[PDB]
Amino acid sequence: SNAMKIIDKLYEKVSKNGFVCIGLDSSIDYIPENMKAGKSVSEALFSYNKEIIDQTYDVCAIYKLQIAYYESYGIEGMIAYRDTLSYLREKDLLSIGDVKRSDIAASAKMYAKAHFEGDFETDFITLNPYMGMDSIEPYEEYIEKGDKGVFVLLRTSNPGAKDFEVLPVDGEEFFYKVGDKMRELNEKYIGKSGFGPIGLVVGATHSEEVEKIRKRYDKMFFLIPGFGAQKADSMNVYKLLEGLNGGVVNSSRAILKNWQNYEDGSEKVGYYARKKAIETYEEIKANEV
Amino acid sequence: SNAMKIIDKLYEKVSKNGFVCIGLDSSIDYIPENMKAGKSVSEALFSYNKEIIDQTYDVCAIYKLQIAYYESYGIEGMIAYRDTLSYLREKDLLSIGDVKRSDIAASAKMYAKAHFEGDFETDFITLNPYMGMDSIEPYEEYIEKGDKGVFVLLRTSNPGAKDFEVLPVDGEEFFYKVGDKMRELNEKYIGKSGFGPIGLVVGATHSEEVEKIRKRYDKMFFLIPGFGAQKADSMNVYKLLEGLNGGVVNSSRAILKNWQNYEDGSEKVGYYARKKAIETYEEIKANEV
Secondary structure: OOOOOHHHHHHHHHHHHOOEEEEOOOOHHHOOHHHHOOOOHHHHHHHHHHHHHHHHOOOOOEEEEEHHHHHOOHHHHHHHHHHHHHHHHHOOOOEEEEEEEOOOHHHHHHHHHHHHOHHHOOOEEEEOOOOOHHHOHHHHHHHHOOOOEEEEEEEOOOHHHHOOOOOEEOOEEOHHHHHHHHHHHHHHHOOOOOOEEEEEEEOOOOHHHHHHHHHHOOOEEEEEOOOOOOHHHHHHHHOOOEOOEOEEEEEOHHHHOHHHHOOOHHHOHHHHHHHHHHHHHHHHHOOOO | OOOOOHHHHHHHHHHHHOOEEEEOOOOHHHOOHHHHOOOOHHHHHHHHHHHHHHHHOOOOOEEEEEHHHHHOOHHHHHHHHHHHHHHHHHOOOOEEEEEEEOOOHHHHHHHHHHHHOHHHOOOEEEEOOOOOHHHOHHHHHHHOOOOOEEEEEEEOOOHHHHOOOOOEEOOEEOHHHHHHHHHHHHHHHOOOOOOEEEEEEEOOOOHHHHHHHHHHOOOEEEEEOOOOOOHHHHHHHHOOOEOOEOEEEEEOHHHHOHHHHOOOHHHOHHHHHHHHHHHHHHHHHOOOO
């Protein structure tokens, strides 16, 4: 019965908890003075994440950690990163290491060891495919065993996407060349759920495009990095899902900083993170017709 | 003496010490038993790096650290990374953090803080431009100050480069769109040397192409990630230099493991690293007519 492959576990989690991905992109700047009082940077970051995790574990499918925030704090940040990941793995919870690494061959094998084992072990990592299939192939050793997944950059919604991602190659955007290669790799590893563990990072761009990408890559999970505050934005996110599944939608700052909007927030960081996580799911789902 | 801007400092280092970049892509597997006995992973990696640095600092322009090797050892690896970078700075030597980071906007600003300040501060980093100009622009705050530079992936010589880097856009390779954008940004910051701090990562592919790239991007410094053992390989690298400057050529394992080839290697790690660093410069320079 219970899912074995990590992609099936994620599908399971999305079915049970909804498609929200909570982004623990944590900063000391976000933490109440009373909670950071007396603590080192590593203790403060970990305590804040723990407070959030404990109140949100059943209202999101997965947590994502933008490792840049932890690297910005040096060794103390990396200690918090390790402690958070260990805590997640203890609580039976899923993690994405948002690392977007770029390397090939031996250096990629070292990142695979760094992020799929040991201190920085996560269930999924994000990967940049610029250097070609030998920036993805070295991770297959892990993916083939069934316990680790990747999300590969495809098409993001930032203004810089207009510089390279969308350039015409043979009558279609560049990024489709990347996507189609991952699509054929993914086919080797399809799980019980009908999805494989080679996913794509896809931003909510505009209606026509999100529907085309969703349909073209219907057996890959989408990591949606975030979304804006306007009505078209949540509709476009909704359109990157298939039956409220097949994707997770990241929310970082809105969740991490929600306590700052309430007079009693300093004492209820996790409660207010929870309130936002729930609202996010409800917002996106309300697009259903 | 003299140069203020970091690119002019690199130019001067290449002028004095030659174009070799030493790749401290260190592994516990490369360290003699006598050197790691009684040491934690962080102590062993740093002691090993110091031994190499102490014997090679006048026979290379700069040291490059592939951070994946350090990330593979978790916190201990990050401590050795920190300590190595600090020692290099203490000794008035240059470093490149080979991190090939991908992120944009606030996450890119976090990576800039991570790698241009504090525990993991280096003089140059590598960057992957896939997500567009907003994956480069956030680092400009540092580049503008004169002390930090970057090397942006352009065209690498791995088999995977055939997948995406070379795809036709407007009748020439995709990577030229990238290089042309970096060229224009570089112009803003040209140093006294005639080069600017926005460089490129360029592999030694084949003769016609290395010549074309060297000429098109004549005011940008090249980081050459490595080269093979055949005659054509050293000549193609030589063709990526301008008057024995304008680039550095990385050599990692050959230098790090050279001690392994001699009966007395175990007590002479730095000595044999030095031997190989010198031989590397000679192999390339032998192509000059």
